[PDB]
Amino acid sequence: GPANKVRFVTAASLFDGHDASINIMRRILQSQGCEVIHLGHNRSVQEVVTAALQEDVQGIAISSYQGGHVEYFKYMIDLLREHGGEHIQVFGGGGGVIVPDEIRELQAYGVARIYSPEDGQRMGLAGMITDMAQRCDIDLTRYAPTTLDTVVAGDRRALAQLITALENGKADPELVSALHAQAKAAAVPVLGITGTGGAGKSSLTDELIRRFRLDQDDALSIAVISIDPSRRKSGGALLGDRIRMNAINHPNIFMRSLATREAGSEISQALPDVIAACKAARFDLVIVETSGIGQGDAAIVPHVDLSLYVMTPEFGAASQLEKIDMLDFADFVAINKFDRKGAQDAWRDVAKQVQRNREQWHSRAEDMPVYGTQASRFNDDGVTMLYQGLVGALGARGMSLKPGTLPNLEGRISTGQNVIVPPARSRYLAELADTVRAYHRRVVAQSKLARERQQLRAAHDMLQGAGHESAALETLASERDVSLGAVERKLLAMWPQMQQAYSGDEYVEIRTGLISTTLSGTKIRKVVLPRFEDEGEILKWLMRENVPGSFPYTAGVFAFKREGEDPTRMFAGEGDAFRTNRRFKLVSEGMEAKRLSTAFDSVTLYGEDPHERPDIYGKVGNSGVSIATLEDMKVLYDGFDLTNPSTSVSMTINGPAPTILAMFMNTAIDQQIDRFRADNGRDPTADEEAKIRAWVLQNVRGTVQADILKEDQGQNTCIFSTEFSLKVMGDIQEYFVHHQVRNFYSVSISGYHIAEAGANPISQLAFTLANGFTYVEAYLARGMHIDDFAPNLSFFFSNGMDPEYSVLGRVARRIWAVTMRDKYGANDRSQKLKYHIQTSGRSLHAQEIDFNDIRTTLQALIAIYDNCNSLHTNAYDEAITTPTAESVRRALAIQLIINREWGVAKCENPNQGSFLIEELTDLVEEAVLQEFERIAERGGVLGAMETGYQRGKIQEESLYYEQLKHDGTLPIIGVNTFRNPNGDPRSSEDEKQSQLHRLTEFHGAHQADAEAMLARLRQAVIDNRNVFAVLMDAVRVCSLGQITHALFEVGGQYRRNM
Amino acid sequence: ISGYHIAEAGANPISQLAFTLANGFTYVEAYLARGMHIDDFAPNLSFFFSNGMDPEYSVLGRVARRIWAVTMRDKYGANDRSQKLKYHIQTSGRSLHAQEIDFNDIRTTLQALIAIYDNCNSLHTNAYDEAITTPTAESVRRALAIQLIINREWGVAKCENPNQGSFLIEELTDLVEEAVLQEFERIAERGGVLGAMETGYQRGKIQEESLYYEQLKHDGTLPIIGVNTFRNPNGDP
Amino acid sequence: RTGLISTTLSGTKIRKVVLPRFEDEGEILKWLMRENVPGSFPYTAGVFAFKREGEDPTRMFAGEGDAFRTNRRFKLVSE
Ligand SMILES: CCCC(=O)SCCNC(=O)CCNC(=O)[C@H](O)C(C)(C)COP(=O)(O)OP(=O)(O)OC[C@H]1O[C@@H](n2cnc3c(N)ncnc32)[C@H](O)[C@@H]1OP(=O)(O)O
Ligand SMILES: Nc1nc2c(ncn2[C@@H]2O[C@H](COP(=O)(O)OP(=O)(O)O)[C@@H](O)[C@H]2O)c(=O)[nH]1
Ligand SMILES: [Mg+2]
Ligand SMILES: [Mg+2]
């Protein structure tokens, strides 16, 4: 494509998980002939710049969708100019966030281009990329040094540019020979790491580097040369090795991503020169990673001092190892992903093969340099064992290094304990699908028997009343009585008594009104019973769709809808704790049913404290409330009695959820302690306070999202390793059990984010239920009684325009009810699936936003029809801006009008009976079960995730949606049809300074107890004790950021996967 | 034969449906007394009902169709073309309020939905600002988008009989139908529509039901979002 | 011929007219007499077999001023 070899560094801004099109802009650059060093999402300026300067790129592409873009790009321009990167051009995404004034401001500041959506429609998507790629079509070898003085001195920016000249072959021959002469005299070890594609080389390399740093106290200068294959046709390349490296962010670590620039070889054609360049730069160790090579490859061997073959337990038969050329030269062999099935057996086959290749029959196979590692696991002892081995090898390879600080332990095999879903239970989703289908087979069988029993006894009476009698009929009828189950027989027996119950004006100690009378005088019954005469139809209906509040709870989990509380629960989250608390009081104004829904800013969502640094500062307060300390949390819910039975608090938080939950619990407790110090005019005693805290935990109502699994399925907002988050999430659930927290739900299992990514209703429902069942299987494998954690499970679904949405809730309820009763044998409280429905954000369009209220009304209606437990209605202008004041009342009026004015809604089961509803229910349910089977044959949710099945399927359904939408096949009123002939088309500066002031004040107040508490927290993780229990005390003297980063030091950060 | 203006005067759905069908049958009896054949004028009969928020509106069309179909076949012995009652539904003008006129689009959507569910022959959707000023070109597009979105985007509407089977629908259908018949009997024992009109029975009954609506609306008993509850803090206009 | 099915984005086939799956011939006859399919006596579910697949004829209501101004608006809208 271009003239020179153009290299880019692409990333999403800090705390910004918006990677929807950063996967597509990388595709285009790779198909125009650019080498893109992709850094993924959630990147600080310091990270992107350090990457750009080392990779020595011509351009940088950043996509900022969370705001705070101005401060971010200004910082990047400043930091670039300061450290010799002023010739690097910075570009901005085509998002509709950066307004025209902010574009001209940044473009004048130093930013190359910031493409407006106006440029999107005009230039085209490929058009913008083409323009951007042509601007960066410059030669960088003219910035390269002509003498080795700067590079040898230690200047890394000179090293990075010297490499560019060598990679392009634009370096003077006399300079190259002097470089190799300097490298030979340097005498530094070069470690080669090769293996198949995706084996975990980059991940393991990162972990090994981490080991080096911790073991030698960052005293070692390590250079890293990673190589990824380049597309033959284009000439460009995808260099996705840096995106894995979490331990290279240090002045002593240097990394350069090289393209093969050959359609065959696995290493760079200029690898020997690039290595010699790093050796001469006085590095202590040089590490080289090759690309995905076949079995018969070993090109890395002559260029390095030591070689490490990385592989997975999946290599087929044992005889295949006799084909792997690299098993003949490898000084070390790492069988990574030792968490997978057959890892143990894989280790012995390889050990025996290496033993044969080396002809060391005088030794044990367990003494071979074959290790079993799990790089995905934080502080994996397996990786450390491999590290210990490598050091000893490099030690005699002429490398001075201090005695280790790491545990010099022994063994070859990883002793992984992170057991989530045991391989024996791998097919759990399939078993569940079998259980539901088994239930339906019984429904048919029993229904047929109930009919035959009735048909006989009826015909017998007709004969006996006509004179002649045939008692033979009774014999067959009595045979049906034994055939009919004890449960089914009781159902038909209670049916007449059931009709008498739902017939009167009251449902009779306690009484409940059954009838609401209209203006016309008509009596509308809350629950309408069928008038079937056939006992086959009665039994069939009673088993498949009973009345609300009876198994399988298809029509709802409760007998009747609650009077005091509507399902309404509206979002709120803006600026600091004070402004949001004002919005909370305004939404709950004049309502006994105080049900709050909290939204946190991107800073809090990633478990970070607000800071002066332009990366974070610009994001504090946007898109959500900034909560950093327990004091902020107290202000957030001041004036509300969290313990009050009519008050429930919802809050959307995932990664840092256990910390936020801990703050909420302390807030709820302190409310009652303050209530006691007021009502009694004295502080409660040691005994009194204990009784208070206990009562608070039991009665506190609310819900925290904390769906970690959904984060590694699209939204990418994960800050902890999935295994660690699941451990702590389990720690939470155990804490709830021990203190009888019966009214708080530990997890709102989301599918909204999934549906927002383009997933059709069936896939959304199927994945969410699957992810829900994964949690169940996880806690069961841990050792929890099903009745202990199942009632604490919440759900979160997205509605929409698709027909399947009308029966989403009822299907979710029945699948849950049946499986929880039959498969897991749980009580009635566990069989009841409670969920929240929020209307489709993907159905709200930017064109003709007034039409959105029509769509949100229809979605709210079926939600209420299908007896949802909680409903949030979107404002019409959410497609363009944030929910305003006038707009949030129109969104709230939708629920109010339906619940109060709409006549059909006076009935609480208007869906039941409908031939369409029941057929759709049957259809959708089966479709979900089949999806359960597809996930189960991939190894369950976790298994499918390692391939990216969910994310892959979602992305497929998204493109299908957008295709038909643009095609006009799928009509969208106001967008692709019925277009308007006339018209073609968030946080105070004080509030930010407030949060900083409050934070530094909080830190000062607990300056003494801070460290001792954080240390206690880390020790809890090391000793595998309950983490949440410590968090209940930690949030009192430690801030959000302090806690998160303490856990980082001991729990590890999420590695950017795919 | 229209019942929109009747409903507009405050008449509840049952009285509206009952009077309109009654007035329709009066025409039939009138033309029959002139000695005309039933199959000659019955297919030329069109109806016009008002929808609204009341539950009975969800089954107004289906009840009107069955009462017509059965009577035209059994009582008057007319052909299939005569047994088919066609009608036009316009949303409630009564349900459109002057306070918070943006909320009216919500109400008009719900009324348009049950109208289309119940297989109406013709539908007119009111603009949100018709409560106050004359409908703007923009306001009339929001009213037109309601029908467009339901007919095109709304998934349940892809099915043409989503009402059928529903235990609520069938019970309401049975209830409403009977209530209408009883009203037929009250008018008949007054001498038919013409006879009742002589005593101002219809006018009288409508005015009674209107005051009952106003009484409950003013009372707060009958909640109206934006009017007698959830009122706008910033100001009444 | 007339299409009975409209397929969704998910692939689900939504039938225009959904029939009951009753086994009791008492329920069948009862349903057939009280609420038959659309376009069959007593036409409870509608007088026509299926809804008109053609776009709904947007009525054009004009009437203000004298005969000339109304005639113009008629001609303009019905262009
Ligand atoms: C990307 C941006 C969008 C987002 O991410 S927003 C996501 C955040 N989360 C949300 O919006 C929704 C939060 N989730 C929740 O509130 C809950 O999980 C849930 C289940 C949906 C709703 O819970 P609640 O409304 O509080 O109701 P509840 O089940 O906790 O009630 C507790 C006890 O009250 C009683 N009750 C409530 N309704 C009743 C009825 N109709 N009949 C009889 N009894 C009833 C009942 O005793 C119940 O206790 P129990 O069930 O017997 O143990
Ligand atoms: N289940 C599991 N996955 C791992 C493990 N180690 C690495 N991975 C993942 O395997 C993928 C490929 O690893 P990668 O670092 O890219 O190796 P490379 O392609 O050879 O550079 C990444 O998504 C890693 O997160 C492990 O020990 N277990
Ligand atoms: Mg890699
Ligand atoms: Mg590589």
From Swiss-Prot, chain A:
UniProt-annotated binding residues for Mg(2+) 2: I227, D228, D241, E289, T290
Region described as GTPase chaperone MeaI: 148-396
Domain of life: Bacteria
Known cofactor(s): adenosylcob(III)alamin; Mg(2+)
Catalyses which reaction(s): 2-methylpropanoyl-CoA = butanoyl-CoA; 3-methylbutanoyl-CoA = 2,2-dimethylpropanoyl-CoA; GTP + H2O = GDP + phosphate + H(+)
Outcome following mutation: F571A: Switches the substrate specificity and enhances the catalytic efficiency of the isovaleryl-CoA mutase over the native isobutyryl-CoA mutase activity about 4000-fold. Is even more susceptible to inactivation than wild-type during turnover
Annotated Pfam families: B12-binding, MeaB, MM_CoA_mutase
Disulfide cross-links: none
CDD domains (alphabetical): MM_CoA_mut_B12_BD, MM_CoA_mutase_1, MMAA-like
Leftover remarks: In many AdoCbl-dependent isomerases, e.g. methylmalonyl-CoA mutase (MCM), its G-protein chaperone is a separate protein.
Protein name: Fused isobutyryl-CoA mutase
Organism: Cupriavidus metallidurans (strain ATCC 43123 / DSM 2839 / NBRC 102507 / CH34)
Lineage of source species: Bacteria, Pseudomonadati, Pseudomonadota, Betaproteobacteria, Burkholderiales
